[PDB]
Amino acid sequence: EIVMTQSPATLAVSPGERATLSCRASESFNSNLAWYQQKPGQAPRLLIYGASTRASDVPARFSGSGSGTEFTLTISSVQSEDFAVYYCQQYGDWPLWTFGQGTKVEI
Amino acid sequence: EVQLVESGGGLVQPGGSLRLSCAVSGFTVSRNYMTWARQAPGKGPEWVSVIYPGGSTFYADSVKGRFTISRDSSKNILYLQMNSLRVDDTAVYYCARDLTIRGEASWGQGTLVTVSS
Amino acid sequence: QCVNLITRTQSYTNSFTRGVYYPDKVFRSSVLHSTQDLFLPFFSNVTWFHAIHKRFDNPALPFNDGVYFASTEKSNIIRGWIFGTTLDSKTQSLLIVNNATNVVIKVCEFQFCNDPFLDVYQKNNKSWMESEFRVYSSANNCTFEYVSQPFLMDLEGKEGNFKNLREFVFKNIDGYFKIYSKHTPINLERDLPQGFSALEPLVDLPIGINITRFQTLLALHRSYLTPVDSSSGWTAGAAAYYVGYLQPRTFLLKYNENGTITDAVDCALD
Amino acid sequence: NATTFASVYAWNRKRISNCVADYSVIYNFAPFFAFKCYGVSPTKLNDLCFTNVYADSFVIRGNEVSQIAPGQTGNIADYNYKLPDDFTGCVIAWNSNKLDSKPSGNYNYLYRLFRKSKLKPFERDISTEIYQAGNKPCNGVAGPNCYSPLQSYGFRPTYGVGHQPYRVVVLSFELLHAPATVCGPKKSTNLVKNKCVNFNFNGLTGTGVLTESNKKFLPFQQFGRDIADTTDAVRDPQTLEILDI
């Protein structure tokens, strides 16, 4: 099935700054990518589905762009709560999908 | 709100058997897809098993032929019976109502499933 | 809808040499042969109905191992054909309609009326304004279709003397229902003529059914200017036609050098 | 080759009866993704005779055309279509990316993934009832977990091999006690004359030599057996050629 890589894997952005993450797929799916946020010791929380729309009670800073084998997630203003781990799930053959590996964002 | 409570985890030797319960509050387990997600401490999550309201159950490539996924509609509890466990099955187990096509998602707290001898 | 008349209120004659058809699709010339088959017996009692056409009847004609029909008439007021067992959404039923433009053949479960009726006036339009279609009116839950060429000879013939005689044989055997037809001109204007001609087959339909009753449908409808005299003019005397039944006997034939059946004898007579 | 192809949720029954199938331009049209034919083989399909033929049309992804099989369930095989286990036919699927997959998106193409039970084989369930995926009743409005049973494919020319629009034409052949109405038996060699030759006309076989038309056959006739119960006059079924044997 389709796997992914996350670039960069050593992300570290200061608070109050724009943040950029990129997901590169292995194969091509039907433009179904889900950006998920997991905090340490917490269940993962979905932010972006289809790489174009935010989730319920998710702020407007997170924005997805791109289609195909490259996707870009942009955080407008990280303020002391979005420092977590991000996965780009590929639900092109949903519910058969694949989550990420790890993108620990440091202060 | 949707609340998922996982229970039954613990230390079980490889080659043994175990049963996990997942209490679900918010909907019916016979009308929703329940994913039995795994997460490694070092790596990210993965899909392991899925279930359909019509009774269609699917397993991953490394877990097929050993696991049983079941539902209790009257008790609203998702059950997972695992047999012939290995060392690689030491992870943190979640009940995942992903449902990411429409755009709502709920994930359980999970239990640290440890398989070692 | 449905029309049933509360005002509801058989002149037998003789068939001499009628009801002979080609038994198969083989050709033989100037020879003779015999067949054990079901024909119309010679010199038999047939039911000549009420010899006018005002009058609109509801009989129950039973179908039994084929029916021989013959009715010399003009303008083709008699058109329909309904076959079945009870025709009330319980057992299988069959409908044949034989209008001027086309023919329609269905096998369905229709709710046929006790006395169904086809459509029709002109009234400064010169075309018949089709009023209603009270034949089945319901129960279209069936899954069959069959359309072919229009069957009968053209209608609205107003010749000074009687011209057309239309002769049919309905043979429902093996679930392989067969139609035999003949259109012949005789101008003598008296009942069944004394003569001889053969009938030819053209339609085989395999469906598989038991037919215990059949009934034919009449043309015209309610008298026009619908507010006045909608439907009260009619009595149980519908039309004039000839119906006979078939029996299995031996009916040794005679072929000419052109293969046309010219003479026949009965082996159960004198 | 149908423009505006019928989608998977509302596959139209196109029952074929009293027709003579060819089974040749079917195979010789478009590069087929999967020409799998379980139960019957497509090579002998032109020789096999069937009573009734159904044709159904699906539009599904390339990862969903493998779901169409007896005993298989999935996104399409559980709620969009179900196959009877006595199926005799083919599961032919296209690879139509040029005709479908608009750049703006073929959002008219959807598929069903909500149902209270499994689909019955050879049953179509087209409804617009709001599915109760949760515990609370819907009562018309989209409540807590009340959603439409349809989900959009969003077909566009950026998708993968298994996610492009895929046109599936499935043929169902059924036989019963009724005589077969759909066959492919059109094959007739040219004829010769004045030669010792075996002949096969309309199934009836024999041998001998041939002579052209001389007699006075009826407008409807095909068999000219004489007094001696011997076949001696025949007609060519394709063209009105009366022969003597």
PDB file of all heavy atoms in Angstrom, chain C residues 40 45-47 66-69 242-246:
ATOM      1  N   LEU C  40     -61.172 -28.918 -36.405  1.00  0.00           N
ATOM      2  CA  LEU C  40     -62.589 -28.674 -36.198  1.00  0.00           C
ATOM      3  C   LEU C  40     -63.375 -29.767 -36.902  1.00  0.00           C
ATOM      4  O   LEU C  40     -63.209 -29.937 -38.120  1.00  0.00           O
ATOM      5  CB  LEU C  40     -62.991 -27.306 -36.731  1.00  0.00           C
ATOM      6  CG  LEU C  40     -64.491 -27.013 -36.678  1.00  0.00           C
ATOM      7  CD1 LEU C  40     -64.967 -26.931 -35.237  1.00  0.00           C
ATOM      8  CD2 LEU C  40     -64.822 -25.737 -37.426  1.00  0.00           C
ATOM      9  N   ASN C  45     -71.936 -28.315 -34.445  1.00  0.00           N
ATOM     10  CA  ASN C  45     -72.666 -27.189 -33.880  1.00  0.00           C
ATOM     11  C   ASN C  45     -71.692 -26.108 -33.434  1.00  0.00           C
ATOM     12  O   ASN C  45     -70.799 -26.361 -32.621  1.00  0.00           O
ATOM     13  CB  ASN C  45     -73.518 -27.645 -32.697  1.00  0.00           C
ATOM     14  CG  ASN C  45     -74.889 -28.131 -33.115  1.00  0.00           C
ATOM     15  OD1 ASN C  45     -75.014 -29.046 -33.929  1.00  0.00           O
ATOM     16  ND2 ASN C  45     -75.929 -27.524 -32.555  1.00  0.00           N
ATOM     17  N   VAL C  46     -71.858 -24.901 -33.970  1.00  0.00           N
ATOM     18  CA  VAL C  46     -71.074 -23.744 -33.553  1.00  0.00           C
ATOM     19  C   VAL C  46     -72.032 -22.660 -33.085  1.00  0.00           C
ATOM     20  O   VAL C  46     -73.208 -22.648 -33.469  1.00  0.00           O
ATOM     21  CB  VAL C  46     -70.141 -23.221 -34.667  1.00  0.00           C
ATOM     22  CG1 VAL C  46     -69.428 -24.366 -35.351  1.00  0.00           C
ATOM     23  CG2 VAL C  46     -70.903 -22.397 -35.686  1.00  0.00           C
ATOM     24  N   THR C  47     -71.540 -21.784 -32.214  1.00  0.00           N
ATOM     25  CA  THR C  47     -72.373 -20.773 -31.574  1.00  0.00           C
ATOM     26  C   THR C  47     -72.283 -19.466 -32.351  1.00  0.00           C
ATOM     27  O   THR C  47     -71.369 -18.664 -32.130  1.00  0.00           O
ATOM     28  CB  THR C  47     -71.938 -20.576 -30.125  1.00  0.00           C
ATOM     29  OG1 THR C  47     -71.828 -21.852 -29.482  1.00  0.00           O
ATOM     30  CG2 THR C  47     -72.950 -19.728 -29.379  1.00  0.00           C
ATOM     31  N   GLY C  66     -57.150 -25.123 -27.672  1.00  0.00           N
ATOM     32  CA  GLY C  66     -57.246 -24.393 -28.919  1.00  0.00           C
ATOM     33  C   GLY C  66     -58.659 -23.955 -29.240  1.00  0.00           C
ATOM     34  O   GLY C  66     -59.623 -24.631 -28.868  1.00  0.00           O
ATOM     35  N   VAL C  67     -58.794 -22.825 -29.929  1.00  0.00           N
ATOM     36  CA  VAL C  67     -60.094 -22.256 -30.264  1.00  0.00           C
ATOM     37  C   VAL C  67     -60.061 -21.801 -31.717  1.00  0.00           C
ATOM     38  O   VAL C  67     -59.105 -21.146 -32.144  1.00  0.00           O
ATOM     39  CB  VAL C  67     -60.458 -21.091 -29.319  1.00  0.00           C
ATOM     40  CG1 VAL C  67     -61.461 -20.136 -29.957  1.00  0.00           C
ATOM     41  CG2 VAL C  67     -61.014 -21.630 -28.010  1.00  0.00           C
ATOM     42  N   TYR C  68     -61.092 -22.167 -32.477  1.00  0.00           N
ATOM     43  CA  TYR C  68     -61.268 -21.708 -33.846  1.00  0.00           C
ATOM     44  C   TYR C  68     -62.218 -20.516 -33.836  1.00  0.00           C
ATOM     45  O   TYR C  68     -63.344 -20.621 -33.341  1.00  0.00           O
ATOM     46  CB  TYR C  68     -61.814 -22.838 -34.717  1.00  0.00           C
ATOM     47  CG  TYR C  68     -62.656 -22.389 -35.886  1.00  0.00           C
ATOM     48  CD1 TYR C  68     -62.072 -21.827 -37.011  1.00  0.00           C
ATOM     49  CD2 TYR C  68     -64.035 -22.539 -35.870  1.00  0.00           C
ATOM     50  CE1 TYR C  68     -62.838 -21.423 -38.083  1.00  0.00           C
ATOM     51  CE2 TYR C  68     -64.810 -22.133 -36.938  1.00  0.00           C
ATOM     52  CZ  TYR C  68     -64.204 -21.576 -38.043  1.00  0.00           C
ATOM     53  OH  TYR C  68     -64.967 -21.172 -39.112  1.00  0.00           O
ATOM     54  N   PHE C  69     -61.765 -19.386 -34.371  1.00  0.00           N
ATOM     55  CA  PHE C  69     -62.560 -18.169 -34.412  1.00  0.00           C
ATOM     56  C   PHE C  69     -62.758 -17.738 -35.857  1.00  0.00           C
ATOM     57  O   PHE C  69     -61.826 -17.801 -36.666  1.00  0.00           O
ATOM     58  CB  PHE C  69     -61.894 -17.043 -33.610  1.00  0.00           C
ATOM     59  CG  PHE C  69     -62.720 -15.789 -33.511  1.00  0.00           C
ATOM     60  CD1 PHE C  69     -63.662 -15.646 -32.508  1.00  0.00           C
ATOM     61  CD2 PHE C  69     -62.552 -14.752 -34.419  1.00  0.00           C
ATOM     62  CE1 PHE C  69     -64.423 -14.496 -32.411  1.00  0.00           C
ATOM     63  CE2 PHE C  69     -63.311 -13.601 -34.327  1.00  0.00           C
ATOM     64  CZ  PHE C  69     -64.245 -13.473 -33.322  1.00  0.00           C
ATOM     65  N   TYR C 242     -68.308 -16.291 -34.634  1.00  0.00           N
ATOM     66  CA  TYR C 242     -68.400 -17.744 -34.666  1.00  0.00           C
ATOM     67  C   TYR C 242     -67.220 -18.337 -33.913  1.00  0.00           C
ATOM     68  O   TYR C 242     -66.061 -18.026 -34.216  1.00  0.00           O
ATOM     69  CB  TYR C 242     -68.423 -18.266 -36.106  1.00  0.00           C
ATOM     70  CG  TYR C 242     -69.582 -17.765 -36.941  1.00  0.00           C
ATOM     71  CD1 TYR C 242     -69.516 -16.543 -37.600  1.00  0.00           C
ATOM     72  CD2 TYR C 242     -70.739 -18.519 -37.080  1.00  0.00           C
ATOM     73  CE1 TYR C 242     -70.567 -16.084 -38.366  1.00  0.00           C
ATOM     74  CE2 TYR C 242     -71.797 -18.069 -37.849  1.00  0.00           C
ATOM     75  CZ  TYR C 242     -71.705 -16.850 -38.487  1.00  0.00           C
ATOM     76  OH  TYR C 242     -72.752 -16.393 -39.251  1.00  0.00           O
ATOM     77  N   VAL C 243     -67.521 -19.201 -32.943  1.00  0.00           N
ATOM     78  CA  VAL C 243     -66.531 -19.809 -32.064  1.00  0.00           C
ATOM     79  C   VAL C 243     -66.720 -21.319 -32.103  1.00  0.00           C
ATOM     80  O   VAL C 243     -67.841 -21.812 -31.934  1.00  0.00           O
ATOM     81  CB  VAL C 243     -66.660 -19.279 -30.621  1.00  0.00           C
ATOM     82  CG1 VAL C 243     -65.832 -20.113 -29.653  1.00  0.00           C
ATOM     83  CG2 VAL C 243     -66.255 -17.817 -30.554  1.00  0.00           C
ATOM     84  N   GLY C 244     -65.629 -22.051 -32.325  1.00  0.00           N
ATOM     85  CA  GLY C 244     -65.679 -23.499 -32.331  1.00  0.00           C
ATOM     86  C   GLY C 244     -64.486 -24.082 -31.600  1.00  0.00           C
ATOM     87  O   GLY C 244     -63.481 -23.409 -31.355  1.00  0.00           O
ATOM     88  N   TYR C 245     -64.608 -25.366 -31.276  1.00  0.00           N
ATOM     89  CA  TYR C 245     -63.606 -26.074 -30.498  1.00  0.00           C
ATOM     90  C   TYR C 245     -63.056 -27.249 -31.295  1.00  0.00           C
ATOM     91  O   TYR C 245     -63.693 -27.753 -32.224  1.00  0.00           O
ATOM     92  CB  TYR C 245     -64.187 -26.550 -29.163  1.00  0.00           C
ATOM     93  CG  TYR C 245     -64.659 -25.405 -28.298  1.00  0.00           C
ATOM     94  CD1 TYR C 245     -65.997 -25.271 -27.958  1.00  0.00           C
ATOM     95  CD2 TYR C 245     -63.764 -24.449 -27.835  1.00  0.00           C
ATOM     96  CE1 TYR C 245     -66.432 -24.221 -27.171  1.00  0.00           C
ATOM     97  CE2 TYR C 245     -64.189 -23.395 -27.047  1.00  0.00           C
ATOM     98  CZ  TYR C 245     -65.524 -23.286 -26.720  1.00  0.00           C
ATOM     99  OH  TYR C 245     -65.950 -22.239 -25.936  1.00  0.00           O
ATOM    100  N   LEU C 246     -61.857 -27.681 -30.917  1.00  0.00           N
ATOM    101  CA  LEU C 246     -61.073 -28.629 -31.692  1.00  0.00           C
ATOM    102  C   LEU C 246     -60.988 -29.969 -30.973  1.00  0.00           C
ATOM    103  O   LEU C 246     -60.968 -30.022 -29.739  1.00  0.00           O
ATOM    104  CB  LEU C 246     -59.663 -28.082 -31.943  1.00  0.00           C
ATOM    105  CG  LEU C 246     -59.554 -26.939 -32.957  1.00  0.00           C
ATOM    106  CD1 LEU C 246     -59.620 -25.582 -32.272  1.00  0.00           C
ATOM    107  CD2 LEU C 246     -58.274 -27.064 -33.762  1.00  0.00           C
TER     108      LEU C 246
END
